[PDB]
Structures are given as structure tokens and as C-alpha cells.
Write a protein that binds this ligand. Structure first.
Ligand SMILES: [Cl-]
Ligand SMILES: [Cl-]
Ligand SMILES: [Cl-]
Ligand SMILES: [Cl-]
Ligand SMILES: [Cl-]
Ligand SMILES: [Cl-]
Ligand SMILES: [Cu+2]
Ligand SMILES: [Cu+2]
Ligand SMILES: [Cu+2]
Ligand SMILES: [Cu+2]
Ligand SMILES: [Cu+2]
Ligand SMILES: [Cu+2]
Ligand SMILES: [Cu+2]
Ligand SMILES: [Cu+2]
Ligand SMILES: [Cu+2]
Ligand SMILES: [Cu+2]
Ligand SMILES: [Cu+2]
Ligand SMILES: [Cu+2]
Ligand SMILES: [Cu+2]
Ligand SMILES: [Cu+2]
Ligand SMILES: [Cu+2]
Ligand SMILES: [Cu+2]
Ligand SMILES: [Cu+2]
Ligand SMILES: [Cu+2]
Ligand SMILES: [Cu+2]
Ligand SMILES: [Cu+2]
Ligand SMILES: [Cu+2]
Ligand SMILES: [Cu+2]
Ligand SMILES: [Cu+2]
Ligand SMILES: [Cu+2]
Ligand SMILES: [Cu+2]
Ligand SMILES: [Cu+2]
Ligand SMILES: [Cu+2]
Ligand SMILES: [Cu+2]
Ligand SMILES: [Cu+2]
Ligand SMILES: [Cu+2]
Ligand SMILES: [Cu+2]
Ligand SMILES: [Cu+2]
Ligand SMILES: [Cu+2]
Ligand SMILES: [Cu+2]
Ligand SMILES: [Cu+2]
Ligand SMILES: [Cu+2]
Ligand SMILES: [Cu+2]
Ligand SMILES: [Cu+2]
Ligand SMILES: [Cu+2]
Ligand SMILES: [Cu+2]
Ligand SMILES: [Cu+2]
Ligand SMILES: [Cu+2]
Ligand SMILES: [Cu+2]
Ligand SMILES: [Cu+2]
Ligand SMILES: [Cu+2]
Ligand SMILES: [Cu+2]
Ligand SMILES: [Cu+2]
Ligand SMILES: [Cu+2]
Ligand SMILES: [Cu+2]
Ligand SMILES: [Cu+2]
Ligand SMILES: [Cu+2]
Ligand SMILES: [Cu+2]
Ligand SMILES: [Cu+2]
Ligand SMILES: [Cu+2]
Lengths: 294, 294, 294
């Protein structure tokens, strides 16, 4: 797209503020940003806020979101679909033209770990180019295992294909499959989907801790067989809904857009790989590390 | 197959009748029928009754089915395998030769949303050519959320490949992935697996209603990440067994042959896409619409 | 690998012995062994003990395993990762060089049907070449349906690719997808992953019996849609954890590395195919048989 040649829009911070006990404002951008997805490989991604996946959003169960999208893309319209919300797609997930803004309001009544993504036709194109992310909705009533959790992180899985190539998007294997981490608390890492960052800079934890991971496989196209090497999931909440409780899972199957809350104990010092156990995907990038110290 | 050149057998209605408090007769055909699977694209399908997927069958838990297959295919044998039933495959799912009939009897003791399909070797060929469908077995004891359901429909997902091409069937990506709807009550639509009908003629509902969808992914080869845009599933019953209860799912993973009952509320007027969230499949047809009016 | 030309190391029996009420010794080899994976097709597999999948391991919940690996491969290092255990991957799943041994100790505190596999980089290569298997951890407290089970077997699903071809491993469809059975009691079959043995020599059962299958899909790359033709699963325990209970499932979705305990009744004499319902995989080998006699 001629109007994207040479474009590299610097990342813009997410903006959120609470405006009532059950109402939260969120402002995001759609913007075109170069991201290094593998060593030596730049992808001129379509993004929210200059990150792919996009910035993490966290709200409380029962919050109504008053969402603004500022479209900085000079030529392509963009939109927002939060899986967390109840909304009319044809009224509330509609396009925002280049250099314009739109505001949409809708409730997040269900706890969990939801995908968000651009909803502009062709949606495959917009997602595959990088317009995906996660919104976490915290349960009013928490999770039954909250008291045991010692540390937590967010991990997102996505694929990368040949750049902006609809034939490949539809018909081809992924070039890369990758994890990223999005920060929940100051000091947490905040990374993009790439083959290397979470190997070079592992997530951190201490011996004996119970770790919670909030996870989502945003696709676009693949399912995920999520596994932490050297442990077993004590507890799993499918989609992050506290009612959807499994125990003692080795591996969690995630559909495309599928989420979970998973919890596990790291018993010994060392480095613990985190994979999709579809090992072709692991080999093309989808291995993160968790470094556990005494 | 030379004996299928020029063959286009008109659709024949399903025949069912109850013959006892726990016994039901069902008669189907195997027949060769041209179906438009994408605009401008005819597939000379192998079918039950001239539909692909085949006609919907609904029985009650505990019914014994006395099933007759009339094979109208002039040259290929066909058979029937209902996932709902307990049967000896080598006695009860056996071939019916061209221009012959066979009758088989077996019980449906388990509630749910089951695949049915031809079972003739190579089964991949028979399924991929269109010999698939759904049988719903209604639970004696209903579902706990029956009182809240305002409207219901059946949706089936299948793939289409290059015509009658075993290499493609085994090794290739699907050409199309599609939804169809099969009628439960007079006035409901009854469609075949194609890329366009349920976009052109959306399923209908009213604002505020809780909708139930009976769903099955018949494959042949792909899994499905089933999602309704703009809502969250309040309740999910995996395989349609009332005991297999999930809540607050964004997306339901379905294996090949996998079913579910899913329920969700449409809160606002508008059009709600229904997808597999494996967006390569969505892009090659697997988007249906639900139009919600005041 | 020049040092593997002409190498065909005879299978070596697994060695296990209990050394305390909660401690068990296990010794395995890594070795290079020719296996006929399809009629006329030899694969010079990388194996544990000359089987692919490897030998079955069964321990009790709460057992600590003191595991020795003897690496007989003349040139490639190998390792062991049991999904059953809690361990430091970087200390306990480390490489054993050619012609050396290593011993590692770790607990199996969680009941279920776990994958084990080589953990040497590239792990895709080691798994795809055949270094996979199952460890069953028996629950202290059994399964609630134990009293109804009349007969049981272990089945494992894996894929085979072009020999030792990392491009194919990462990017290609599987050449074959296969079941094997691993013996639990004297007289049970013990087979390798191939397209034909469990068709030629079906698993055996008697009319009316409730059968339990312990199942795992070791991949490397595919998910599985596990189904027994002519029955419905009465009970399913995901990953073999008794708490993860489903009922009345037609088909069980298994991630890569995913396990289950599944139980079903065979009501009539005959032969019952056992498939992955991803029928492209079934067609490339993944059909086993269960012969049921009066
Ligand atoms: Cl409440
Ligand atoms: Cl692993
Ligand atoms: Cl009852
Ligand atoms: Cl969507
Ligand atoms: Cl206990
Ligand atoms: Cl089948
Ligand atoms: Cu309040
Ligand atoms: Cu308000
Ligand atoms: Cu308000
Ligand atoms: Cu690279
Ligand atoms: Cu506002
Ligand atoms: Cu967009
Ligand atoms: Cu979506
Ligand atoms: Cu609540
Ligand atoms: Cu701590
Ligand atoms: Cu927290
Ligand atoms: Cu291209
Ligand atoms: Cu793919
Ligand atoms: Cu892939
Ligand atoms: Cu702790
Ligand atoms: Cu634990
Ligand atoms: Cu616990
Ligand atoms: Cu626990
Ligand atoms: Cu529970
Ligand atoms: Cu009666
Ligand atoms: Cu009767
Ligand atoms: Cu009778
Ligand atoms: Cu077309
Ligand atoms: Cu009759
Ligand atoms: Cu047929
Ligand atoms: Cu079937
Ligand atoms: Cu019942
Ligand atoms: Cu109504
Ligand atoms: Cu009804
Ligand atoms: Cu061909
Ligand atoms: Cu496929
Ligand atoms: Cu596909
Ligand atoms: Cu209502
Ligand atoms: Cu609701
Ligand atoms: Cu409700
Ligand atoms: Cu509810
Ligand atoms: Cu429930
Ligand atoms: Cu003891
Ligand atoms: Cu001890
Ligand atoms: Cu000890
Ligand atoms: Cu062959
Ligand atoms: Cu010892
Ligand atoms: Cu190895
Ligand atoms: Cu593993
Ligand atoms: Cu226990
Ligand atoms: Cu018996
Ligand atoms: Cu036993
Ligand atoms: Cu090659
Ligand atoms: Cu594959
Ligand atoms: Cu495949
Ligand atoms: Cu019995
Ligand atoms: Cu039964
Ligand atoms: Cu039972
Ligand atoms: Cu039962
Ligand atoms: Cu239960």
C-alpha cells in the first residue's frame, strides 16, 4: 500500500481512566508500526497503539467501556471488536476512517481472558497484520485459588505470515508463531509478538511459587496446545471464567481466540520453557522462558 | 466417475414417523446432486437426500431408530453411521449397493448433537463429497436453561475440497469452509453448506432474546473455533450432553465431528456475524449472519 | 547422519523396579532402530528402547521416579521430559551424551495419562523422529467408574514425516498418522506407531463389556478428534485426572500431548473402528480396530 511506504508511527500509550464505579474510558489508536518479529525481520504491522498484540486492557466485571478509536492509518479504515462485551456488531464495531475517531459504549459483564481485534473487512487481513490483543475482565468474586497465587503474568500467542499477503493468510502455514507478555503491574515486561524476546529476557519467578498465567491464543488461524515444561497445571479456568474449572492438566487446548487462566507451581530453580506443544509452531518461535531463582 | 456425468438427482424429502413410544422409522436416500457451494461453483455432491449436509434428524433420548437407506447412486455403494447410536459397525453400518435398500436398527440412548455420515471405505472420500449431517437426540430431562431460551436454530460447519480429489482431501487446504442451517420448526430456513446463503438471508431474531444454537463441525478434516460476534456464550453443553456444562465462553472449540449446544443473548439491534475464529476458514466462507430486530 | 547409516539397534526391554513405598527406578535407553511404519516403509527412528512410541511406564500417584537414560546413539545427545513430573527442566531434563548415562529424580504427584519425550534441541526433531511415549500415573483414589470397567487398553497417536527432514517437520503435512497400543497386563499387545498392525491384529473384547482406553496424542504437530465408531463415550476424564469429568461425548478433542481416560460399552458383536475423526489423518493411517466377540 503506497501510502504505508516509509510509515513507522511511534507507539502511543494506551489511555484509560475510571469515570464511575462501573464505567471506564479507554482510548486506543490504530497505527502502522515496524516491529521486529524475528531477528532481522521487520513487519510493518497494523496495530493498536504501535504494539502487536496490542496493549493489555484490564477492567472489572460489570464495567461499561466507553471506547474511542483514533485511526492514524492514512488510508485503511479500522475498527474494534472486544470479545468481552455485548454489542451490536453492525452499530458498535463499525469502521473509523483515516484520520478520524469513533466512540462506542458497551458492557463487560462476563469475567475472563478475552481476545480483542480489528473487525474491518477482510477481518483475516486486519488480524493477521497485527490488530489483535487481550482484554481481561476481573471476576467480582475472584477465583477460588487467588489466595495461593504468588506471581502472575499475561502471555499471548499469535502467528505471523508473509507480509500483507492474503493468499498466504488463507492458504499458507505460518512463518512464525510467537509469544508476547503484557504488563499487569509496574515492572512487568511488555513485549510484542516475536521469536526471541522472552527467550533472551525470561519471565522471572522464585522457587516454590505458584504462578498464574492469563493466556489467550489470538491466532489468526491456529489452535494452541499450551504447556509449561517441568510442571503440571494445578488449576485451569477455561476462558478465565471461574466456573470452568479443570485440575491437573498437562496441556490446555485453546481454540483460535481462546483464553484461559492457568496456575502451576515451580518447585526447583532453573529455566522452564513455555510452549505450544504443536512443535512445528514451537520451532517457528513459540517458546518463551520462565527463569526461577532461589 | 463416468456413471455420475450428467447426473443430478432431485432432492427427496426425509421420511420419519414414530412407530412406538420409543421407536422411530427413518428413511433416507443416498443420491448424487449438484449443489452451488460458492457463487458460480457447482459441486456434484454425494449426499443424503440431495442435501449436503444432509437433512436434520431429531429423536428423543431412548428412541430406537429403524433406519432405511435407499441407494440411488448408480455405481457407488453407500452406508450410514449415526454417532448417536450404539451399534456393531461391521453389521449395522454396512454398505447398500446401487439401486438397493438396507434397514438397520439401533438405539439412541445418549442426548446430544451428533454427527452422522456415510461409512463406506474410503470414508474420507464419502464424507468430503458431502455425506455428512446431524442427528439431535433430545434429553428426557431437557437442559437446565430451557426456560430461558427464546429462539433456536441448527448450524453445521463443513469443508469443501477439489471435486472428488483424494490427494486434495488428504493433503490440501480446504477450498471453502461453510455453514448451513437445518430447520427445527416450520418456517426455519433449510440450507446447504455454501459460502453465501446465510449472509444473504441471515438467521432472524429479536432484541433481547436468548438464542440457542445446536452446532456440529462435521469436518471432514478441520477443527472449529466457534464464536458469535458481539456476545459471549452464557451456557455451553459440550456434545449437547446436559452434564458437560461451561459458562461464559467466548469461543467453543469443536473437534472434527464435535457438537455443542450454545446459548447467548443478543442485547441490541443489528447484524451479528457467526464465525469459526480460525480466520482463514472464515475468509473461505465460514461466516453466517444473525439479524436482530426490535 | 553418517554415523546412523546401517545402524539398527535391537530393542532393549524397559527396566523398572519399585525401591520404596513411594519410590521407583526406571532405566531406558535412547537408541536408533528401524521400524516399519507403513507396508514397505522403514523409518530409522530415534527411540526410547527401540520402540516408537516408547515403552509404557506406569507408576502410582505420589511416586518419585529415579530415572536413568543410557544413550546408545553414537552421535546425537538425548534427554527425557516426563509431563507427569515436577522438575527443573534446565537441571533435570538435560542432555546425556553418546555412550553415557544420566540419572534424574523427580516426583509424579498428579494422576493421569501423560506424554513423555526427548527434550533435546531441536525438540521438534527429536519428537518427530520417534522419541515420544506415555507415562500413566494411577490415582490413589482410582476413578469413580473403576467398578464398571471390564477391560482396558492403552492407545497412542503420533505422526510420521519425511525422514529426519526439518523443513517437512515444520512446514509439511504428515505422511502418516498412526495408532499404537502399549501393554498393561500380560498378554496385551505391544505395538509401534504404524498404519497397519492394529487393523491386522485388532484389540480384543467381549460383547457387552465396558472398555477403558488410556489415550494420548503425542503429536508432534497435530491435534486429535478421538472417536470409537459404533459407541459413545459414557465417561471421559480429561488428561486422566478424575476431576475432569465429561459424559456422553461422541468425540474427544486432544491437544498435541493431550491425554484422556475414555470409557464406552460395546453392545453387539463385530469390529469397531477407532479413529481420529480428522479424516485426512484417518486415511493416512489413523484407524485401529476393536474386535468384539460373543
Ligand atoms: Cl453476584
Ligand atoms: Cl514440552
Ligand atoms: Cl432418568
Ligand atoms: Cl470475530
Ligand atoms: Cl488424598
Ligand atoms: Cl467415524
Ligand atoms: Cu455498584
Ligand atoms: Cu454508568
Ligand atoms: Cu451510565
Ligand atoms: Cu529467523
Ligand atoms: Cu463516557
Ligand atoms: Cu484494522
Ligand atoms: Cu473475534
Ligand atoms: Cu459475576
Ligand atoms: Cu514469592
Ligand atoms: Cu491479579
Ligand atoms: Cu502471495
Ligand atoms: Cu494453519
Ligand atoms: Cu501450523
Ligand atoms: Cu506459594
Ligand atoms: Cu501443585
Ligand atoms: Cu492445588
Ligand atoms: Cu490442586
Ligand atoms: Cu472444580
Ligand atoms: Cu416408556
Ligand atoms: Cu420397541
Ligand atoms: Cu422393539
Ligand atoms: Cu468464489
Ligand atoms: Cu420398524
Ligand atoms: Cu457414501
Ligand atoms: Cu464418525
Ligand atoms: Cu438420560
Ligand atoms: Cu422473543
Ligand atoms: Cu427446542
Ligand atoms: Cu488432485
Ligand atoms: Cu486441513
Ligand atoms: Cu485449514
Ligand atoms: Cu428472554
Ligand atoms: Cu447473558
Ligand atoms: Cu445465564
Ligand atoms: Cu449465566
Ligand atoms: Cu454447571
Ligand atoms: Cu506412604
Ligand atoms: Cu523416598
Ligand atoms: Cu527418598
Ligand atoms: Cu503405504
Ligand atoms: Cu534411587
Ligand atoms: Cu533425543
Ligand atoms: Cu512436552
Ligand atoms: Cu491425589
Ligand atoms: Cu468381560
Ligand atoms: Cu487398570
Ligand atoms: Cu526436505
Ligand atoms: Cu500439520
Ligand atoms: Cu494434518
Ligand atoms: Cu460390564
Ligand atoms: Cu453406556
Ligand atoms: Cu454410565
Ligand atoms: Cu453414564
Ligand atoms: Cu461428573
Amino acid at each position: 500500500i503506497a501510502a504505508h511506504k516509509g510509515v513507522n508511527q511511534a507507539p502511543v500509550p494506551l489511555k484509560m481512566e475510571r469515570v464511575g464505579p462501573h464505567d471506564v474510558h479507554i482510548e486506543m489508536t490504530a497505527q502502522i508500526t515496524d516491529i521486529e518479529i524475528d531477528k532481522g525481520k521487520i513487519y510493518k504491522a497494523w496495530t493498536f497503539n504501535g504494539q502487536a498484540p496490542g496493549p493489555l486492557v484490564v477492567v472489572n466485571e460489570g464495567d461499561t467501556i466507553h471506547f474511542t478509536l483514533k485511526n492514524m492509518d492514512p488510508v485503511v479504515p479500522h475498527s474494534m471488536d472486544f470479545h468481552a462485551v455485548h454489542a451490536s456488531p453492525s452499530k458498535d464495531f463499525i469502521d473509523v476512517m483515516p484520520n478520524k475517531s469513533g466512540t462506542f459504549t458497551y458492557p463487560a459483564n462476563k469475567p475472563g481472558v478475552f481476545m480483542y481485534h480489528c473487525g474491518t473487512k477482510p477481518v483475516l487481513q486486519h488480524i493477521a497484520n497485527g490488530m489483535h490483543g487481550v482484554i481481561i475482565v476481573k471476576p467480582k468474586n475472584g477465583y477460588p485459588t487467588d489466595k495461593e497465587v504468588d506471581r502472575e503474568y499475561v502471555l499471548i500467542q499469535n502467528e505471523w505470515y508473509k507480509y500483507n499477503d492474503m493468499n498466504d493468510f488463507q492458504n499458507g502455514v505460518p512463518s512464525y508463531v510467537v509469544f508476547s507478555s503484557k504488563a499487569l503491574k509496574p515492572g512487568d515486561p511488555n513485549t510484542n509478538g516475536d521469536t526471541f524476546t522472552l527467550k533472551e529476557k525470561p519471565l522471572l519467578a522464585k522457587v516454590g511459587e505458584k504462578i498464574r498465567l492469563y493466556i489467550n491464543n489470538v491466532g489468526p488461524n491456529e489452535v494452541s496446545s499450551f504447556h509449561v515444561v517441568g510442571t503440571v497445571f494445578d488449576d485451569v479456568y477455561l476462558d478465565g471464567n471461574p466456573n470452568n474449572h479443570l485440575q491437573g492438566m498437562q496441556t490446555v487446548m485453546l481454540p483460535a481466540s481462546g483464553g484461559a487462566v492457568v496456575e502451576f507451581t515451580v518447585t526447583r530453580p532453573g529455566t522452564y520453557p513455555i510452549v505450544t506443544h504443536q512443535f512445528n509452531h514451537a520451532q517457528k518461535g513459540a517458546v518463551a522462558m520462565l527463569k526461577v531463582t532461589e
